[PDB]
């Protein structure tokens, strides 16, 4: 109603921008171990105009991919609305959910892999001890 | 507040506010919101707080279901290879890890005694074999994937036909209120054609089994749907199945323009310049000729009818659809189905009263002759009450107002020497 | 919306008067009276009371011709917006003393941004608003420099100092980031990140929380 | 890293969509990851990455359809 809009100072809390999504992803994936020194810098793949380095690293590439995923969800909703409809709004809450899922899944799978590798090393040491026993 | 997962954690205890009330947020609490209506537009406030888990069956979902079912049935080796490929990611690795853990716990239990060697050795060698198998599986991944791709491409048209058939059958409710069909009905049809196929008792060649499965699927779906479907609508369902098969068949044109003109394009603005043509043609026949000649294959329709001398005789024939003169102009010879489509357009133009009859002809030229022959025969439904009907599924006998269907069931019960407790439902008792 | 037409049997008795929005002349008079009353706090700006009001109404008039309710349902402008503008300028000038014309124009532009620019949707509207704001500011204040105007942020805060003073963006961003860290450490349970839009919205919300009837 | 990214994006974003739309979104994400030179396991099927065999068997014993969409 126009009466509500008057007597109230209006503030357009617009949707999160590309740079906002990039910053959210970067500060929410800082704890995650994503540093790959052997990253090969590709061509193209532009999503965030202000990529922090001109040649991106692995972590910046991952965050750019995350914001690209959010943008592709927005574009998929737009296309679905274009050809027919029946869509559900994508919101920054979805982005936070996706980032939290990424963090939890990455940590869980990396922990499982590290546990299996440590078990393999323990088995190697025990079997070397058995080798010494057999030689004796 | 619950969806937002707000927590007023204070005093070493977890808290949450529900209205004016304050309540402890007990751990291991999950809430699963649910709905039954596929088409609901939730507000963004609710949309942001939930993960939408959609179980609605769609074209792609049913296509994948049918593909998996036919791959498991027809080609158990390809299905086994697919299962092996899926397992190779984590399940085979888990099995190998557990085998190695068993080796470790046996070796530390036996202390690696040289007398115990043999009990170790077999295990060790077996473990090697296991890894060797895994190694072989990781050395032949691409070949198995390309084989599975070839088989899936071979079986894809059947899955597309199955999905299209089910969705035509489901949409059949628009024609009449009594044509409500469920997904379980089509799944039963698919399982009956896939497993209980009398035409597949000895067929071994995979392509032959696939062709037999497709043909019997079309036939069985049509028979089961039309057994409980009005006689004036059998031709509609047969034409729809013919269209589905035509979209599925290869080596044929899509006939999109001809079909669109047949269904909807016949009603277009072409009344201007409706010449009387010949004495045989009437005003509506002239208009139909004008509309049909808009198509590229019939652009010379005017001269083609005017030059012909026996065309006027054909117009007054008892069954024009039997002998339809070759009138369309085509640069290259067409398949019999294209001939049927063009003659069907001609019959829609000239003598529309035979259209239905010619429609049947078209079906016999597309889905094969005697496709409707089962419908003409009397209802041998003793087989339909023996098998094809589960006890949980009732048998509804809907009769045209003024007809009685209790006679058929009473005679079959007498034949099958099974008692029936016939009850009239008019009274309250 | 929500209004039902009155019955003819009742309308027959009640004459109705269409009180439209006050015209540019009426607005100039009323808010020039308000500005002359407000600028008496700082004598050095008294002679600037008459032009300033004009600039304000000019912007309002332009801000009424563009941004019609057809474009967005909330693009509605009224003399209440002008009253909030005057009240915000007065609130900024209330504790502060010995202000040159520079500070007056700076708070004028800041209030114009916070009332007319942050309600817009597309970047085109915001850029149009900024250019027209500095255009009218230079039009009605020709002898003044652009010092109030090339400053792109134009932000005010009173956390760093004892009153509303123009503060640079970097140190305010650092302070707000520290406060946000403390806030989500004790009050909230989910980490909060501070990007530029968050800083702008926090500044707008604080400004609203300070003004009367805000 | 890329595989976990894809799985999380699927289980968080790729909901409410039909099977074709889910596959299209996953294909787009994988194509971007390839374009960004991010090493994700090629042709990864998300069904067993997020759920081992025993959970699948428990779900099947829990009256669940064997469709890939249902899994």
Curated annotation (Swiss-Prot), chain C:
Entry superkingdom: Eukaryota
Compartment(s) of residence: Cytoplasm, Cytoskeleton
Signal peptide: none
Comment block on domains: Dynein heavy chains probably consist of an N-terminal stem (which binds cargo and interacts with other dynein components), and the head or motor domain. The motor contains six tandemly-linked AAA domains in the head, which form a ring. A stalk-like structure (formed by two of the coiled coil domains) protrudes between AAA 4 and AAA 5 and terminates in a microtubule-binding site. A seventh domain may also contribute to this ring; it is not clear whether the N-terminus or the C-terminus forms this extra domain.
Family: Belongs to the dynein heavy chain family.
Pathology linked to this chain's protein: Charcot-Marie-Tooth disease, axonal, type 2O: An axonal form of Charcot-Marie-Tooth disease, a disorder of the peripheral nervous system, characterized by progressive weakness and atrophy, initially of the peroneal muscles and later of the distal muscles of the arms. Charcot-Marie-Tooth disease is classified in two main groups on the basis of electrophysiologic properties and histopathology: primary peripheral demyelinating neuropathies (designated CMT1 when they are dominantly inherited) and primary peripheral axonal neuropathies (CMT2).
Task of the protein: Cytoplasmic dynein 1 acts as a motor for the intracellular retrograde motility of vesicles and organelles along microtubules. Dynein has ATPase activity; the force-producing power stroke is thought to occur on release of ADP. Plays a role in mitotic spindle assembly and metaphase plate congression.
SUBUNIT field: Homodimer. The cytoplasmic dynein 1 complex consists of two catalytic heavy chains (HCs) and a number of non-catalytic subunits presented by intermediate chains (ICs), light intermediate chains (LICs) and light chains (LCs); the composition seems to vary in respect to the IC, LIC and LC composition. The heavy chain homodimer serves as a scaffold for the probable homodimeric assembly of the respective non-catalytic subunits. The ICs and LICs bind directly to the HC dimer and dynein LCs assemble on the IC dimer. Interacts with DYNC1LI1; DYNC1LI1 and DYNC1LI2 bind mutually exclusive to DYNC1H1.
Protein name from the UniProt record: Cytoplasmic dynein 1 heavy chain 1
Organism: Homo sapiens
Residues of the full protein shown: 2718 to 2931 of 4646
UniProtKB/Swiss-Prot annotation, chain D:
Top-level lineage group: Eukaryota
Location of the protein in the cell: Cytoplasm, Cytoskeleton
Clinical condition linked: Charcot-Marie-Tooth disease, axonal, type 2O: An axonal form of Charcot-Marie-Tooth disease, a disorder of the peripheral nervous system, characterized by progressive weakness and atrophy, initially of the peroneal muscles and later of the distal muscles of the arms. Charcot-Marie-Tooth disease is classified in two main groups on the basis of electrophysiologic properties and histopathology: primary peripheral demyelinating neuropathies (designated CMT1 when they are dominantly inherited) and primary peripheral axonal neuropathies (CMT2). Cortical dysplasia, complex, with other brain malformations 13: An autosomal dominant disorder characterized by global developmental delay with impaired intellectual development. Some patients show signs of peripheral neuropathy, such as abnormal gait and hyporeflexia. CDCBM13 is associated with variable neuronal migration defects resulting in cortical malformations.
Domain statement: Dynein heavy chains probably consist of an N-terminal stem (which binds cargo and interacts with other dynein components), and the head or motor domain. The motor contains six tandemly-linked AAA domains in the head, which form a ring. A stalk-like structure (formed by two of the coiled coil domains) protrudes between AAA 4 and AAA 5 and terminates in a microtubule-binding site. A seventh domain may also contribute to this ring; it is not clear whether the N-terminus or the C-terminus forms this extra domain.
Assembly and binders: Homodimer. The cytoplasmic dynein 1 complex consists of two catalytic heavy chains (HCs) and a number of non-catalytic subunits presented by intermediate chains (ICs), light intermediate chains (LICs) and light chains (LCs); the composition seems to vary in respect to the IC, LIC and LC composition. The heavy chain homodimer serves as a scaffold for the probable homodimeric assembly of the respective non-catalytic subunits. The ICs and LICs bind directly to the HC dimer and dynein LCs assemble on the IC dimer. Interacts with DYNC1LI1; DYNC1LI1 and DYNC1LI2 bind mutually exclusive to DYNC1H1.
Function per UniProt: Cytoplasmic dynein 1 acts as a motor for the intracellular retrograde motility of vesicles and organelles along microtubules. Dynein has ATPase activity; the force-producing power stroke is thought to occur on release of ADP. Plays a role in mitotic spindle assembly and metaphase plate congression.
This protein's name: Cytoplasmic dynein 1 heavy chain 1
Part of the full-length chain shown: 3504 to 3574 of 4646
């Amino acid at each position: 109603s126009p009466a509500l809009f008057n007597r109230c100072v209006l503030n357009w809390f617009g949707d999160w921008s590309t740079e906002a999504l990039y910053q959210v992803g970067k500060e929410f994936t800082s704890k995650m171990d994503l540093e790959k020194p052997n990253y090969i810098v590709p061509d193209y793949m532009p999503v965030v105009y202000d990529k922090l380095p001109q040649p991106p690293s692995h972590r910046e590439a991952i965050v750019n991919s995350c914001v690209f995923v959010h943008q592709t969800l927005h574009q998929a909703n737009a296309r679905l609305a274009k050809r027919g409809g029946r869509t559900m709004a994508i919101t920054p809450r979805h982005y936070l959910d996706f980032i939290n899922h990424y963090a939890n899944l990455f940590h869980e799978k990396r922990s499982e892999l590290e546990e299996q590798q440590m078990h393999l090393n323990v088995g190697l040491r025990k079997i070397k001890e058995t080798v010494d026993q057999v030689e004796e | 507040p619950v969806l937002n997962r707000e927590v007023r954690r204070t005093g070493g205890r977890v808290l949450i506010t529900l209205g004016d009330q304050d309540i402890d947020l007990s751990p291991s609490f999950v809430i699963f919101l649910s709905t039954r209506d596929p088409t609901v537009e939730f507000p963004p406030d609710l949309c942001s707080r939930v993960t939408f888990v959609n179980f609605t069956v769609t074209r792609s979902s049913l296509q994948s279901q049918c593909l998996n079912e036919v791959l498991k049935a027809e080609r158990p080796d390809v299905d086994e290879k697919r299962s092996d490929l899926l397992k190779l990611q984590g399940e085979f690795q888990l099995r190998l890890r557990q085998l190695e853990k068993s080796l470790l716990q046996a070796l530390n239990e036996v202390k690696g005694r040289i007398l115990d060697d043999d009990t170790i050795i077999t295990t060790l060698e077996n473990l090697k074999r296991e890894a060797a198998e895994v190694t072989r599986k990781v050395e032949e991944t691409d070949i198995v994937m390309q084989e599975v791709e070839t088989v899936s491409q071979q079986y894809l048209p059947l899955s597309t036909a199955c999905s299209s058939i089910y969705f035509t059958m489901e949409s059949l409710k628009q024609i009449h209120f009594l044509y409500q069909y469920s997904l379980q009905f089509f799944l039963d049809i698919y399982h009956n054609v896939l497993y209980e196929n009398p035409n597949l008792k000895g067929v071994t060649d995979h392509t032959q089994r696939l062709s037999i499965i497709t043909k019997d699927l079309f036939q069985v779906a049509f028979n089961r749907v039309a057994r409980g479907m009005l006689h004036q609508d059998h031709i509609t369902f047969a034409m729809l199945l013919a269209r589905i098969k035509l979209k599925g068949t290869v080596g044929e044109p899509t006939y999109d323009a001809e079909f669109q003109h047949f269904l909807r394009g016949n009603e277009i603005v072409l009344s201007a310049g409706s010449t009387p043509r010949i004495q045989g043609l009437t005003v509506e026949q002239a208009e139909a000729v004008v509309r049909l000649s808009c198509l590229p294959a019939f652009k010379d329709l005017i001269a083609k009818v005017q030059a012909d001398e026996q065309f006027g005789i054909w117009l007054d024939s008892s069954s024009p659809e039997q002998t339809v003169p070759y009138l369309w102009s085509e640069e290259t010879p067409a398949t019999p189905i294209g001939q049927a489509i063009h003659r069907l357009l001609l019959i829609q133009a000239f003598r529309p009263d035979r259209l239905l009859a010619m429609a049947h002809m078209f079906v016999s030229t597309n889905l094969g002759e005697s496709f409707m022959s089962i419908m003409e025969q009397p209802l041998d439904l003793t087989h339909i009450v023996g098998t094809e009907v589960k006890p949980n599924t009732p048998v509804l006998m809907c009769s045209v107002p003024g007809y009685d269907a209790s006679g058929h069931v009473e005679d079959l019960a007498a034949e099958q020497n099974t008692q029936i407790t016939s009850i009239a439902i008019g009274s309250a008792e | 919306p929500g209004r039902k037409p009155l019955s003819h049997r009742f309308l027959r008795h009640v004459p109705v008067v269409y009180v439209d929005y006050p015209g540019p002349a009426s607005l100039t008079q009323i808010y020039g009276t308000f500005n002359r009353a407000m600028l008496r706090l700082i004598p050095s700006l008294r002679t600037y009371a008459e032009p300033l009001t004009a600039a304000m109404v000019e912007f309002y008039t332009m801000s009424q011709e563009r941004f019609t309710q057809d474009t967005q349902p909330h693009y509605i402008y009224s003399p209440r917006e002008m009253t909030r503008w005057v009240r915000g300028i007065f609130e900024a000038l209330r504790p502060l003393e010995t202000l040159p014309v520079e500070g007056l124009i700076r708070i004028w532009a800041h209030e114009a941004l916070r009332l007319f620019q942050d309600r817009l949707v597309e970047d085109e509207e915001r850029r149009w608003t900024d250019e027209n704001i500095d255009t009218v500011a230079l039009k009605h204040f020709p002898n003044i420099d652009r010092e109030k105007a090339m400053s792109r942020p134009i932000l005010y805060s009173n956390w760093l100092s004892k009153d509303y003073i123009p503060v640079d963006q970097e140190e305010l961003r650092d302070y707000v980031k520290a406060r946000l860290k403390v806030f989500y450490e004790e009050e909230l349970d989910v980490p909060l990140v501070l990007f530029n839009e968050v800083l702008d919205h926090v500044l707008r919300i604080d400004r609203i929380f300070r003004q009367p009837q805000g | 890293a890329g595989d976990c990214l894809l799985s999380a994006a699927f289980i968080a974003y790729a909901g409410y969509f039909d099977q074709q739309m889910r596959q299209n979104l996953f294909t787009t994400w994988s194509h971007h990851l390839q374009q960004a030179n991010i090493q994700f396991r090629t042709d990864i099927a998300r069904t067993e990455y997020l759920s081992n065999a025993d959970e699948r068997l428990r779900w099947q014993a829990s009256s669940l359809p064997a469709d890939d969409l249902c899994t």
